[PDB]
């Protein structure tokens, strides 16, 4: 049990439980009725990290490979497939192979 | 009139039988009823 | 009977909202309903027919319904108005360019 | 309780005629019944 | 304060910064463990949670905000979503492993499917004659 | 229907009088599990487990350790169900 | 406050309709005026005016001819839907030398 | 929905509506009719929504 | 002028003044418009039907 | 509950196809239509 | 009136038709003024072929004629569709009775409609349509029927 | 009120193991006649090895835990009106201040309640002042 | 001045004990006092008192009128069957009148204002022919849709010109 | 149209006169009512004033602009509460309104571009003069410079067009067609940033997040649409060059769509969800548009209009939470069904419209656009399915988590729903149901 790791956390971490109660039950700022919430560090931490982590981003092999295979290869491959199929289909069309009977989507 | 009939008969038949087994082992009353629903519905879709 | 209360937010504002909506909409609807009932029943629909060869309808002749008759003749510029508008304006712009 | 009767007499202007082997038409009853046998037997269990 | 006031610092690179950061996030000196900060890292933000699931956390513990099973000041995991009970997470270890769940499903599906198509090749029937239709030029013969 | 504090008491008493391995006469209502009941390490949770089934809810795993008396059990059931009043 | 205060509240206070939190009548006249201008003026009369608008895009007129034109071509014995913008005789194709492979399109 | 249970309010009109539908269904069966009422919204490129 | 419209419609006139001025100006545009007034190639009356009927 | 118990019987028997109830009118007619029409092994065996 | 409910459905049909037709004869005929509304006849126009290289007004006139003509021919496809629609609804056995004899009109209509207007997309004016016909005429004369590749 | 520590003794790791086992019997055996048999048969399996060395206790958990995990009913008898129930936590109620914001005419339906509500509110203020001397 | 509560003091009374788990784990004798008090004044005996003009405020004049012709019945019919049955009679008179009135309107609109060859974008109708029966007038009936013009008539086969 | 223009100019003084917030509001709605009455247009340019015209394409866009520009004043009243220079706010709004009318009616390309880029200023006032987050500064930098950095360069294309053409009326360009391969990118990409495009979405989440209810409503309600309106007018002559290089744009839009939807799932901010959502929908609009087929274009016009309306209403919802619980987070906002259940109705409805549930002018769009793309290339279907699938997916999450779970413990007493906000939500949605009756005016413009 680490010899009181659970305990050592216990002392301080149970103090702010009461302050949360004091804040929540606070008749005065609840009476002001302006809305808002008791401040919570984890929430404030979380928002700030969520909005800002570029200053941490190091453009290394990891991030490059991650991003490359995340969208880049998807974008390139899909676009290439689209252009390739269309090139074939339009090639048939401008060759006039399929007359005005068989073809589909006559009305877009 | 097309292989969609063959494909559906596969699936509807299978699920009604899968449900027809799972219902025995299930213990949440409403859940057993729902399984019977699927077991019966699979029959409908297969005859169709 | 043996009612035990329930914590429920206010319903007043929402109920008032519906009431204002129902109030004003009926307010607008009633003269509108009067107007539409009047024209259609006091006058009703002009009947389609052929051209009298010697005649020439004015643009308001070409709508069947009377409220259309009132709207088109009085309130909306004729298509022929908004046609020559462009022909004028495109004439100048082509020449200028 | 009346169930399909009202429909059965008012939906099929051309009731499907089915003259099948006796070992098929009746089979629908006993392959059905053995399920209930199992359903009420496999549940009924002695302690040990 | 505002978000820029709360922006997390860069990854701590010596033990004193580890002590400071653990306090910044109210974590104990070992509780604090920054991300790998290898090129896609938040830096000093602690790496918590990421377990099997949030609902695995204590059901009956006194929670300040039971909603997420969360007490007061405490660093929210960078992936709070993707592990929340409303999202990918469970309460108990799975019985088997991923291959088991997919294999048990799909292996059966492939076999039963293929065995059906084999049996469709031999589609049984009732030995009855072809359905007769009146029409011009058709002269089926009565058994008379 | 609501729940009556006296009936909660008699009901935990009924099961306690019912439970064989406890001292049969069901000595003083405040009988500590290890003192006069002699309830062993495992007999204690057998008590809690019957109380569960009787009162329609699990007791928390550690919070059973808080339950160290039939008075506690009433006190824990009372906190749950608004029985003080 | 006590029982009768809650039971029969005074006409001093007033519940703001969200528009003005200072004067009762200013709030109520704003809401009264705002509601009229928005709802009746647009969403009744205006809806009515559109619903009885005359032919603007000439869709109905287009389907006037649609019956006639089709009927005109069916007793006329000419193609109902002629596939030529003008008469294929009216057009004057230039010679193949003028074409000189000007990437003819189908 | 201010003096009578909403359950009553919907229930009565529901039974009334469907009995009417049921009887109309019989009419459709004894005559074998199929109506296809249509109200168009827009139409472009020769399609009719 | 019921004290519920006091100074409010009064100032509100000026926006309506804008519409009047806006209307009159654009009507004068319909004046510089006239080059094809009945002389188009689609609606254009050839000669006659005048009868004091300046269609638009 | 002798009413709910009895009613739950009626649902069972309609669903169980006990004769001249809902299932019997419906489940029956389907199953011999399966017999009448040429069908596949699994589809046949699986329904029963 | 052989059938009982049909001999009753008639009764509600008399109930429903009664007041409405009374209303028609009672508070319409004594309250209706007579008025007439005719139907356009737009004069033809010198199409793009006629107009000059830079005659912007004329080109604008041609396109409007093209658009209205498009809207009609656009339609004639719809009406033929509606016409075929009725036939397929005619009788449950009656599909092959008049599908091909009636549909094929709609088939020809579609292909003709495509050829004239199809394949241009929005913004298409008389110019692009007209010259497309020119291109097709050239192709037909050189490479033969469309639907054969080239030689 | 006290929030307990998370430390656990091997006695508890073994007794709550017995608790989960009893549950796992339920989810796999229902008939109370069948149950008490097998539950007491389970007890013998927790009794034959009552007192062993710590090391054997660790191996005993190494087997005990697996038995539960490998023999857990795919549909455990989750408890009806408790956490994880099939209908538990059906609805919630908001903090009382929602009642504080009733429109005065809305307030005018239960004056006796609201009057007592007003009194209790001030007395709560006194209580909270006490709670840590403000 | 202005307000929303009329001047009520925005707090909350319950405290730690709002949570079932919190009350169930530990809760002090002073907390037993408040919680019992809270659940003691939870009860209510009399009922929702009536505020007369609250109905007026939440009932605009336009609504007032058309309540009257059917509500005026209630004031006199109320003692005969009580209020509950009297209103029930009021309500279903109202809805029954609405339903039957709409029926004729809809039947009228399909009889005289169908979507014909003139107006378009309305409810265009189309049907199939009835089922003949041996012994019927013109039993061996011939097709009526003689020519394709019959199909998609939409009133155009009956044109004025 | 000078009728409208002079009306707005004579409304400008009311900003100076004290206590005219509500008088201005009614007037803006009233003139919207007047502009409603004026409706007879065809595809040709109509109402040709000195240099102002109006058309199917411009008529509806103007109506939305007048519509939304009046709804600003319903949305924002905290300005009055704070007395935060209501005069500058009202003046900024009207100035913006005039610019929009003149942008959408400028029959010349250069006049159009002039007002188009003149709108850079008043919007920037609206965010900066009434922003909340400290990010408001860098956000304004992103907004302005992403725009100007490409919006300026089309100025060359415009003048190059003049030199080769001799004017800039829209009909005159249509007569010609250009294929110099830089004209195409210079105009296209310059509009694509304001569209915006997925690869240049970057600014847009920031601008919305740190902007007031009003500015965000403007940003998502017109600016994105205004970019698209220019496209519809300009691609007339970019066809051949577009055909050669079009697969790239349609690819990134479609690919970016599923991605940004997955960003929405993982996102944790009401404005961020809506902002990314609005980018997703404008991705599909950009796709159908670049198809250039009749179905695509006529549907694009519809989806721009419907999307603007739904995006506004969702922003009013985001404002409501931001103004009660004082924090944009998903975590803080929750369980509001218990606090404003009659409001959660509107939460559901606006969410419904954004996931294309009928009767909804949005939905009417996707039928048109999806038909176009599918015809254009069958390959698209493999991503169109997922694009719509994840579209509805995050909207479900947004609706549920915000309104469903058990309430938040630390939440200080806040007033309840009120007529202003209720009427605001009806006004954005109910016309979004109205229009389907008469889509032909909002559906046919080509
Ligand atoms: C329109 C409008 O709002 O008019 C007022 C009114 C809606 O307010 P309401 O009927 O008084 O709501 C019930 C109480 O107010 C009490 O309402 P509540 O405070 O208990 O809240 C119930 C509900 C309020 O809404 C409802 O209860 C359902 C009524 C339709 C909305 O809103 C919620 O809080 C639940 C979340 C919303 C879920 C979305 C439900 C609508 C689905 C639409 C499917 C189409 O609509 C009507 O006049 C008729 C509605 C009947 C349905 C016809 C379709 C319209
Ligand atoms: C085959 C058709 C299956 C239809 C379900 C699609 C998967 C998404 C979904 O909504 O399923 C439910 C899923 C899990 O929800 P559930 O397990 O019930 O509770 C949360 C547990 N932590 O719900 C979710 O977790 C939401 C996940 C977001 C949607 C992702 C869908 C991915 C689609 C394939 C990749």
UniProtKB/Swiss-Prot annotation, chain F:
Residue span relative to the full protein: 68 to 152 of 152
Organism encoding this protein: Drosophila melanogaster
Superkingdom classification of source: Eukaryota
Job of this protein: Carrier of the growing fatty acid chain in fatty acid biosynthesis. Accessory and non-catalytic subunit of the mitochondrial membrane respiratory chain NADH dehydrogenase (Complex I), which functions in the transfer of electrons from NADH to the respiratory chain.
Gene Ontology terms for molecular function: acyl binding; acyl carrier activity; structural molecule activity
UniProt keyword terms in alphabetical order: Electron transport, Fatty acid biosynthesis, Fatty acid metabolism, Lipid biosynthesis, Lipid metabolism, Mitochondrion, Phosphopantetheine, Phosphoprotein, Respiratory chain, Transit peptide, Transport
Biological process according to GO: [2Fe-2S] cluster assembly; mitochondrial electron transport, NADH to ubiquinone
Localization terms from the record: Mitochondrion
Oligomer and partners: Complex I is composed of about 45 different subunits.
Stated name of the protein: Acyl carrier protein, mitochondrial
Family: Belongs to the acyl carrier protein (ACP) family.
Curated annotation (Swiss-Prot), chain N:
Localisation: Mitochondrion membrane
MF GO annotations: NADH dehydrogenase (ubiquinone) activity; ubiquinone binding
Broad class of where this protein is predominantly found: mitochondrion
Catalytic activity reported: a ubiquinone + NADH + 5 H(+)(in) = a ubiquinol + NAD(+) + 4 H(+)(out)
Keywords: Electron transport, Membrane, Mitochondrion, NAD, Respiratory chain, Translocase, Transmembrane, Transmembrane helix, Transport, Ubiquinone
Entry EC no(s): 7.1.1.2
Residues annotated as transmembrane: 4-24, 56-76, 93-113, 114-134, 139-159, 182-202, 218-238, 245-265, 272-292, 297-317, 330-350, 373-393, 426-446
Top-level EC class as recorded in UniProt: translocase
Classification via PANTHER family: NADH-UBIQUINONE OXIDOREDUCTASE CHAIN 4
Protein name, entry field: NADH-ubiquinone oxidoreductase chain 4
Lineage, opening ranks: Eukaryota, Metazoa, Ecdysozoa, Arthropoda, Hexapoda
